């Protein structure tokens, strides 16, 4: 517990500790059982064997601490591939609700960096598991093996860069759709303006309740117009190509 707390969560530091203990054991290797100095005889082999057993047991149990977050990385593998299947089957150039599609496009650009991070994590994981088989690990049946996940992850990356890029270049249609949407929004804003100066109930002869209802209708449609304008602006800035 003390050494684990001192190390904390660090896979590379863990591998450094593993190579340190491995080289310490390698240096410890010896055949003599008694170190003779003058007429003095000292037992050396019994404690040697006991502490070699100590080294072996501690090294073995330290290895067991690693099977956990590897399970975490396989869970990451699954959450990537299973969700990505539906995500790649989801979007298309049509379905003018593309404000959601461009949201997913921004999501996948944001996840490019996470994909790179997970790739270097997979590199560290493959080094660690290589250590694991050269440390004679009995592979559990429910353990998901390295080559399966690496192959399916490479396939995931290939499909992602094959399809998500393609749908990204053909955006000029989406660009002109956003253009016509925003010019319609501007026209509606000008119309709402003209309606505002025409509708000014600032005169007090009007009944407060009826003019209040009229202003409530105007404010409902004006909130709708503001929602349209803000959603067009957010779609434009998320797509960020126009």
């Amino acid at each position: 517990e003390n050494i684990y707390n001192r190390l904390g969560e660090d896979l590379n530091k863990w591998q450094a500790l593993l190579v340190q203990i491995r080289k310490a054991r390698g240096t410890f290797d010896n055949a003599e059982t008694k170190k003779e100095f003058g007429p003095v005889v000292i037992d050396y082999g019994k404690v040697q064997s006991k502490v070699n057993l100590k080294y072996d047991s501690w090294h073995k149990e330290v290895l067991s601490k690693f099977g956990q977050m590897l399970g975490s990385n396989m869970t990451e593998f699954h959450s990537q591939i299973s969700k990505s299947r539906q995500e790649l089957e989801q979007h298309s150039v049509d379905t003018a609700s593309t404000s959601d599609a461009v949201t997913f496009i921004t999501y996948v650009q944001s996840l490019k960096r996470k994909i790179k991070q997970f790739e270097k994590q997979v590199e560290l994981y493959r080094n660690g598991q290589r250590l694991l088989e050269k440390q004679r690990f009995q592979f559990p049946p429910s353990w998901l093996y390295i080559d399966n996940i690496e192959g399916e992850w490479g396939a995931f990356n290939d499909i992602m860069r094959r399809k998500d890029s393609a749908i990204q270049q053909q955006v000029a249609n989406l660009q002109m759709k956003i253009v016509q949407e925003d010019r319609a929004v501007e026209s509606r804003t000008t119309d709402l303006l003209t309606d505002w100066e025409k509708t000014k109930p600032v005169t007090g002869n009007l009944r407060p309740e009826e003019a209040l209802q009229a202003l409530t209708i105007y404010e409902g449609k004006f909130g709708r117009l503001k929602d349209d304008r803000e959603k067009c602006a957010k779609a434009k800035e998320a797509l960020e190509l126009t």
């Binding site: 003390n2 530091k13 450094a16 500790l17 340190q20 203990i21 310490a24």
Partner: peptide, 14 residues
Amino acid sequence: SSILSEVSTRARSK
């Protein structure tokens, strides 16, 4: 390197 050595340097008492 070390680490395994440096952790061993904080023996509790004497």
